[PDB]
Design a protein around this nucleic acid. Sequence first.
RNA 1: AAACUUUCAACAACGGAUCUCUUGGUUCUCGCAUCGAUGAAGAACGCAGCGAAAUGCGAUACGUAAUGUGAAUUGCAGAAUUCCGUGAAUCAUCGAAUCUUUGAACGCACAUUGCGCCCCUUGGUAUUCCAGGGGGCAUGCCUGUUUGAGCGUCAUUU
RNA 2: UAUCUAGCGAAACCACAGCCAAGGGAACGGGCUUGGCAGAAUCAGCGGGGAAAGAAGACCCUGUUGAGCUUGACUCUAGUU
RNA 3: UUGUGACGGCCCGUGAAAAUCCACAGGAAGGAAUAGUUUUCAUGCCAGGUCGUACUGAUAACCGCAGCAGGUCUCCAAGGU
RNA 4: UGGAGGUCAGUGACGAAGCCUAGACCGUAAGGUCGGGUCGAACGGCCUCUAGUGCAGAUCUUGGUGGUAGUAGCAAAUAUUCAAAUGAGAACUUUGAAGACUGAAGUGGGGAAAGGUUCCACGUCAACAGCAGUUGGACGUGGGUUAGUCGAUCCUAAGAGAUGGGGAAGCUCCGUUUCAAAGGCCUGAUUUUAUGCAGGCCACCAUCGAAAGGGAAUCCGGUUAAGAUUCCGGAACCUGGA
RNA 5: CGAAUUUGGGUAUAGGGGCGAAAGACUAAUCGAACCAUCUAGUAGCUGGUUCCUGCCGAAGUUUCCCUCAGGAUAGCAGAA
RNA 6: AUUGGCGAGAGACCGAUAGCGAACAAGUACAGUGAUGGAAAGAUGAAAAGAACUUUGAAAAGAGAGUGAAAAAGUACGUG
RNA 7: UUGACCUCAAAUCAGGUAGGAGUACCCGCUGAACUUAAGCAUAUCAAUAAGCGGAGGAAAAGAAACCAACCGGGAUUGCCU
Lengths: 81, 155, 60, 119, 135, 50
Amino acid sequence: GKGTPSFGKRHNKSHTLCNRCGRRSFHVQKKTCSSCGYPAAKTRSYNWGAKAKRRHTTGTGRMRYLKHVSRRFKNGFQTGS
Amino acid sequence: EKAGHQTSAESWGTGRAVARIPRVGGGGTGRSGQGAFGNMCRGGRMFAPTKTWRKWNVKVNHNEKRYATASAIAATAVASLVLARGHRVEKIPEIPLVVSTDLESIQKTKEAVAALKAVGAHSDLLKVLKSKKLRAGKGKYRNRRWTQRRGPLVV
Amino acid sequence: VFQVSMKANKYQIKKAVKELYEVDVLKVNTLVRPNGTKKAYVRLTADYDALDIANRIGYI
Amino acid sequence: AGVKAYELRTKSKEQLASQLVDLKKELAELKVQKLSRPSLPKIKTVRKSIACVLTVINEQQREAVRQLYKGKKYQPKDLRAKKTRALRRALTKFEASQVTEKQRKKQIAFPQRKYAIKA
Amino acid sequence: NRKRPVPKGATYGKPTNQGVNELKYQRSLRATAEERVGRRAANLRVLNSYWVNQDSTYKYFEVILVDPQHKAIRRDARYNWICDPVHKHREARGLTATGKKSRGINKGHKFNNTKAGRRKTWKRQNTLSLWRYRK
Amino acid sequence: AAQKSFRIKQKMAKAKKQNRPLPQWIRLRTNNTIRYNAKRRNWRRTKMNI
RNA sequence: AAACUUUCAACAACGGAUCUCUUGGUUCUCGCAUCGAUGAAGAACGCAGCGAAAUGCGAUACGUAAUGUGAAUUGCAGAAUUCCGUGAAUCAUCGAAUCUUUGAACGCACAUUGCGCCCCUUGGUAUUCCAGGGGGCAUGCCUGUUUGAGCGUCAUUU
RNA sequence: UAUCUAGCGAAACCACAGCCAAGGGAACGGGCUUGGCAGAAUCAGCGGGGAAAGAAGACCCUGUUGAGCUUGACUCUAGUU
RNA sequence: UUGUGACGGCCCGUGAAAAUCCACAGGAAGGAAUAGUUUUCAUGCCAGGUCGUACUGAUAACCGCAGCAGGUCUCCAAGGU
RNA sequence: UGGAGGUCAGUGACGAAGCCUAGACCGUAAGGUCGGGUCGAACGGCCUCUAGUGCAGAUCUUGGUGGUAGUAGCAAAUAUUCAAAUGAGAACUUUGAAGACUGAAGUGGGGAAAGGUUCCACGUCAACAGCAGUUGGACGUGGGUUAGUCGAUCCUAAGAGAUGGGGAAGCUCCGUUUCAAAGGCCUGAUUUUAUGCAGGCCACCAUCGAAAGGGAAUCCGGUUAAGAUUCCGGAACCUGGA
RNA sequence: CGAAUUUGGGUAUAGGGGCGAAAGACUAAUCGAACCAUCUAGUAGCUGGUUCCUGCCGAAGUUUCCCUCAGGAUAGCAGAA
RNA sequence: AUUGGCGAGAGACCGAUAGCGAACAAGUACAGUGAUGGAAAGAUGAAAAGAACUUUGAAAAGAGAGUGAAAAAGUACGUG
RNA sequence: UUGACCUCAAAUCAGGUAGGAGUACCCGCUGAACUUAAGCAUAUCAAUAAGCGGAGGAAAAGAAACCAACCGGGAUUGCCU
């Protein structure tokens, strides 16, 4: 009864959505996210998880502020008009 | 160096009616269960991947280089060798061809062409001009789109 | 019946309807719709006519 | 086309507030009309006009606060410059160019001489 | 000593690596003292430290720190070198006096292993240098 | 579930909004090769499992 | 002797090889140094006249200012003399702003769009209650300010 | 149910294939040799054969290949004294 | 069938906590007269935000690769024998 | 065979490459050359250079396709039938009639977890419902979830977990009142200055943790295509304020 | 089949670890040591495969040593220069 | 020194089963509770000129016709 | 009694500052095993991978408690050797 009848019994999420990353990796009872390590300050990352670093890194999102830094540096961090 | 190896494929072993090549794990992807990590495998690493520490430049003795240069200079003065090399020098009075230093002092392309016409190198010029043809392969999109002959060398 | 800012509560909706349409309201009900936007049923007092206010707003 | 920021800049506080209010009213009415009309591209122009009025008001307010804080140190953080965290933690020109009196005496006594080797 | 932090002493390897007890930390008690002090007072920069007292259980040290944001240090070029970012966490990178001593940074034949940096030296003398015209 | 949280309901709303086919005019847009929505979802086929 | 098995060809199928192409990759070389509590990287939810999406942006939401160019955008529609012009544009540049909920994430909490407190303003006959608008309240540490504590301790009394 | 019809419609398996007797042969042939023989296309059954299919024998041996367990094996070790 | 009550049996098993609300002891403090106290008596005035709420809950809405004879907690419960 | 240096001022939109052709020639052969068809943009001979350079197998890899084969099979859960309507088309849709079943620890009426719009209406049948389909939980377009009283929210349970402090190189571990100087709560001060203070009381250990535990309070009738202890009509109750 | 009962939800225990009324049982179809990524293209005296043509020459399964006996070194046999 | 970032220039490199996993709405679709795993997918034509109209069908569609250099290019599109 | 001083506190006191990302290169700590030794334990792999802390455009090192033994050289770094 370890196969289909036991799969009939699984309806209790052990992971819900995480605040820091929306990945469904937040362990409810452990209170920690299995992907980003939330609520720890440091984002969870490993040097054996190169693909994971690819998935979660700079340039993967919008870069709402960092994208303009190169332009501002090229112009010398100017203030005026 | 990581081409073909960015997978966690493991061999299934024997007993599963498939070859023993490493296979991609997981499911619901279409790539799971597929062969990996082999030259025979689609998406795998090539056999003996090309390395940058292959020998590119090859050393030659200075004296042998100068021997070859002297032989080439001496061959430039053989009338038959230039024709065999295909340089349209039939109309030239005699070779080696020596022109005054006013040619060194020349300034414009029109008068350079005029000098070539005067001394008989123009035929070589039209050979180069009419030899222009598209390359015969994938060298076109490697910044080698056209081929043409070699004209006179003004020294 | 209004589409309402998702951050607006019943107090704010009542105040805004009163300020915008010069009408006294009797009750406000709200629900977050399955498409994710707030929907407010604002019942006016008997002194006002919702139909007249609607055709004043522009939709009959 | 909508309203123009240069002519908006000549208006005063009450004028800009009044323009904002009736622009908001017109946007509301256009939303009502859009509810029934197939396409209504004027709503984009009116929204842009509200953005123009708002940015002019904000520029006036920020310039007034800049005038208020002019001359004194401790500017508000959103009013002072935004170069880079490191570029702000870095020593200023004066602080970097500071040198001790011993090194200053040595530098004035023996500055790198300008010389050429010909004769 | 620094007891190996493995459970029940099982190291899971060769008998050469099976040791747990008499293993010695490669940094000094001074180094860990100023590391902890700098981590607590993360807004200062660890200038130096010295020994003051010791009993059986503890060694006691005193750590000198400098504020890089104080205007008495930022001006006055006598000590504002510490205010440049390259001296962030000298105690953590091993740039203090105890750090240099533990790294082995010293001139001579006795420090051939660790003079310009142990790992840098190892990289330099384990790299394969190939030229265009092979030598 | 009937007793939802607002986070779950917001995800439900976003999924319902995203589940719609291609507007007809993007097809006519120039230099366009998109023909349909390839991220379409059915509640029986694929679970978003939030 | 057709039916049937097989072989071959023509035409038609199935399939997507080959050939040619290439806004992609890979490797080498050259130059430069610039993330974040002035809130980063990342996440979530939204914003287009008609959009669901590796686009862009943030309730000023496919963007607003300023500057340059100089007449477009375009799939359809469209404000509609904006065209000898402080002026089109899914343009470029970009120095002013806006920048939802979050996030090192900072009032407390967080599988809750949960619960406070402080200060001004406006309403409900209100310092207290309720509601709305704005502004705040994390921790370690440094320098200073103020208020203190300790027979730790020094001068000034029976 | 099987069966026949309408619709719908897979899989295992497949070097090529598919009648035997004896011979010899890797000493138990569908093919080879020598004989018997040998007539399209097939349906339902059947379980003799295909040394039928299912799985790089799980027994045994070999490998200077492991692992679980045990001990007065060798070499250590947490703890403890 | 459900609820309640008064009882009886069992245990080397005797069968949660907290918020919260009320009450009692005590007597601080305060209180006269054309008016004091009582808002634990009656009547009268105002407000009550945020999020969920549809539907299935299974031989078709969940899990088992599926509209899978499997698995998955619970309430109501007519007549006759 | 791919690419490279020279050369044939080589072939080519008047048709390069590729492909197909029981057509021809040449070489022992690897192979080369040509006739015809198709096609539409590049390619070859020679002298050399170079290599990711030649496949029948590897239970090879990826993709595609067969024979088997119109074959196994689509047979559990008692069962369907007649007639109209709609429709191109009806064993399967709608309606009417009949026969039945579940038989109230139901094949009924609702909920918890889970799902996420599957709810409802209109239109529609290419795909999906292993037959069919006019039907559908499918496809297309829209509509729909209304609360002081139901929940969450508040409490604490097992437990989880900051602070103070102590370990640890450190990511972090312990610890939850501990060797801590750990706060909020009554009435006067109360507009020469406030919310200060010579007013007064005390001394909890943060916090999170239950949609079945504990808890402030709502019922009836009507109403929708789809919501209702939520809307409307009526009739109440609680909490907090004045 | 009234209890060492059955069961929901919450919570604790995590891999040489847990948990076990004990079967090496169970720990997400995985258990005499889970799963995931990496070291790692781990090593294999062992099995399998190893891609064009023609021409000329053309073997060995033996000697010695080897934890050597499915393998090497050495000498022999062979080609080429 | 520098397989990251930002600008450039290049190659006897690869040429859509190759080259990065990704030439495309690619770290996408979707698989797993989770850590993680992770594709396939380029080419009409110079220009849609993307087939008006007739006819037969309920329709899909066919047959004509038409556009185009070509429909032996008809979106299921280069060659095939 | 009034004032210091020392040490220790408190404040939504004034102003700052740290955290987190990315880590190719750089500075340290911690730290294997596969592997080779034709077995294997020292050794090897390797003072490497994984783990942790910390910077910059470079970092680090750096003006000798050096090298040397010479007729002596003369901070550090990198290349050839």
